[PDB]
Symmetry: none
Subunit: 100 residues, 4 copies
């Protein structure tokens, strides 16, 4: 599921999405998969920075239903500015997978 | 999970993995994610053909834990020979995601 | 996951945990399962009241990893004081399951 | 999900259900939750023995949607004859939860 407003760093199976770069602005904690960011009010196409928890891989897609351009985010990683990966204010679906 | 031996075509959320090209040889039905094909005896590095069910996306990785080269497989699709995608006898992890 | 601070009543698949009886004090919205309330700062052994959403069952355990005494909570239910079920300030794990 | 026909012992997150005691007869491998055993042809009310994988807890209910009498099954455990727990040929729903 998704939760509004985060703090600190993501735990295993969690992904922190921030509206502004450098982890600022509105934030959301996500676990599991979300095939349509529109199901979350104001989430679609506004994410600018991301944090991925340990033993966790994240896949962010430009379009809903895991379509369009996308990239893989490694465990315990973070991107302060999605523009650097050509996905600023454009993500519309995401996969959150974990492992041992 | 992973289950040995398949027949017909995959249903939503199912992916059929075959040891030989053209959907022949030992087979496996997979749902959800599998971060290490090593967890299933004889599954690692032997897949040659694939079938993905409707409303389903499949992401196959060369290494375990979703690392290494990979590709996205579209719903209701199939590849008779994975050499065509540079992934014959090399898949070691996979993510199966669905949507409505 | 677990998310701090709740309001209103839980929706399907959500369980609201309150630190004080009568749904007062620090609160948490939980979905899915949590095998160790220790993973959430200040959550372990402090729950005093609960609310379970529609089409949802909740299983609260005295110990972590679903061990020790426990009880089943019915959909759309609430307990204003967990002492009534011998589980005040003692829950350490919980399973949240839904059905149609 | 559920899969027909098992062998060996359950891995983490898996539960093996057998139609006859002592792990004989038709068998099914289950992961995740199943709120209505009737969704699986011939599964409802026929289970006589069970095996639960490591770091895994299972909850078997007499009625669907996790209602009626039920018991908890510990990780790496197994019951050769469910009559001993007063649930022979009666299980109709189940929860499969894992932990680290
Ligand atoms: Ca933005
Ligand atoms: Ca988009
Ligand atoms: Ca092969
Ligand atoms: Ca490989
Ligand atoms: Ca309390
Ligand atoms: Ca406790
Ligand atoms: Ca039987
Ligand atoms: Ca029954």
């Amino acid at each position: 599921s998704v939760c509004k407003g985060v703090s600190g760093n993501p735990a295993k199976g969690e992904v922190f999405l921030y509206k502004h770069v450098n982890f600022q602005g509105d934030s959301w904690k996500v676990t599991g998969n979300v095939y349509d960011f529109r199901s979350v009010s104001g989430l679609n196409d506004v994410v600018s920075s991301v944090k991925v928890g340990p033993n966790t891989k994240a896949f962010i897609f430009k379009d809903d239903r895991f379509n369009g351009n996308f990239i893989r985010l490694e465990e315990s990683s973070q991107v302060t500015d999605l523009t650097t990966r050509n996905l600023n204010d454009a993500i519309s679906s995401m996969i959150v997978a974990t492992f041992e």
